Ligand binder design. Structure first.
Ligand SMILES: COC(=O)[C@H](Cc1ccccc1)OP(=O)(O)[C@H](CC(C)C)NC(=O)[C@@H](NC(=O)[C@@H](NC(=O)CC(C)C)C(C)C)C(C)C
Ligand SMILES: *[C@H]1O[C@H](CO)[C@@H](O)[C@H](O)[C@@H]1O
Ligand SMILES: *[C@@H]1OC[C@H](O)[C@@H](O)[C@@H]1O
Length: 323
């Protein structure tokens, strides 16, 4: 039975986490994203000036083309990419998927053109939302799932230190105490779960739903929750140059917690100080608006405080504080 560990590393300010993936013999640094189901890479089909600063996949060397298939995706921050599809061998932390669909980029929006921290994305949401036309394809995880010791993966994202993606096993040394599980609703293809209530510093409120999303840097919440949080942060203000609420870097921020099936998951106020806003001398908050989309996005700010188990049996998610 297979299992493996892939080590991830945060980029500056923990903006994204990248892990090496070997595709047909070339290793690329990909952003593992539990919020989407497409494995796409910078390729030799892009314009040569866009290939610059990246490790690229050359499909003609090892790939088997799926003639006539395309993919096209749009993410939450407006970025997008599209291209064609090949099958190849994809290895992550020593686990190999043979004949994995590899989505070679033909076009990428400006956001990706300017991000040289990754060479593409490895989706880990449910395969039901993979964008490949005319027949959708399975994610790396769905491809190898039946070969792993247990059909699950687990993640520890850390603040300015390397972390891990555990495939097919749970590493009990990565969290304190025991895991608490909650059911997942995969009807929209996401790892969606319910929280029963939340506490933002001195204020507590009713529960809501959200997705466990490794691909989003911040903790995005309903505007009512964000207002409630920052009303407790002296001098907090929104700054469109920074991307949301900012405050003095020395501020004492309140903790934020959510109650999930009996377990309190706490994000300490020191993790809510994302870093320099890059707008003078303020810091950007780790909690920001979800822009009225109707569900919360439990991104990296939240994951940096937990060890999370993504279990295809249920499916369900398990949580425990990171050791
Ligand atoms: C279609 O599904 C997606 O787009 C999913 C789920 C989703 C749906 C709707 C709203 C938000 C989130 O996002 P995702 O795949 O994680 C997607 C992946 C990314 C690498 C383009 N993240 C996003 O689009 C989020 N973008 C981010 O978090 C960007 N981060 C920053 O701009 C750093 C700033 C915030 C300091 C990326 C550069 C990392 C936005 C939600 C804020
Ligand atoms: C993950 O689990 C497998 C299955 O037991 C081991 O063979 C592998 O070395 C790693 O511990
Ligand atoms: C990344 O690869 C495997 C090991 O678990 C990890 O410690 C290393 O940094």
């Amino acid at each position: 039975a297979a299992s493996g560990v892939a080590t991830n590393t945060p980029t500056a300010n923990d903006e994204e986490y990248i892990t090496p993936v070997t595709i047909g013999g070339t290793t690329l640094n990909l952003n593992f994203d539990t919020g989407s189901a497409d494995l796409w890479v910078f390729s030799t089909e892009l314009p040569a000036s866009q290939q610059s600063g990246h490790s690229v996949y050359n499909p003609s060397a090892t790939g088997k083309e799926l003639s006539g298939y395309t993919w096209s995706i749009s993410y939450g921050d407006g970025s997008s990419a599209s291209g064609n599809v090949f099958t190849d061998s994809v290895t992550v932390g020593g686990v190999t998927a043979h004949g994995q669909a590899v989505q070679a980029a033909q076009q990428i929006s400006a956001q990706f053109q300017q991000d040289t921290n990754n060479d593409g994305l490895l989706g880990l949401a449910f395969s039901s939302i993979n964008t490949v036309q005319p027949q959708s394809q399975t994610t790396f995880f769905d491809t190898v799932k039946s070969s792993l010791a247990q059909p699950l993966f687990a993640v520890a994202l850390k603040h300015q230190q390397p972390g891990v993606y555990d495939f097919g096993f749970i590493d009990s040394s990565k969290y304190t105490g025991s895991l608490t599980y909650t059911g997942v609703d995969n009807s929209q293809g996401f790892w969606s779960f319910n929280v029963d209530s939340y506490t933002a510093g001195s204020q507590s409120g009713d529960g809501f739903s959200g997705i466990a999303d490794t691909g989003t840097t911040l903790l995005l919440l309903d505007d009512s929750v964000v207002s409630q949080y920052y009303s407790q942060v002296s001098g907090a203000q929104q700054d469109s140059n920074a991307g949301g609420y900012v405050f003095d870097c020395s501020t004492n921020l309140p903790d934020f917690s959510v109650s999930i099936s009996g377990y309190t998951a706490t994000v300490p106020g020191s993790l809510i100080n994302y870093g320099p806003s890059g707008d003078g001398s303020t810091c950007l908050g780790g909690i920001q608006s979800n822009s009225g989309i109707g569900f919360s996005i439990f991104g990296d700010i939240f994951l940096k405080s937990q060890y999370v188990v993504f279990d295809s049996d249920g499916p369900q998610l398990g949580f425990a504080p990171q050791a």
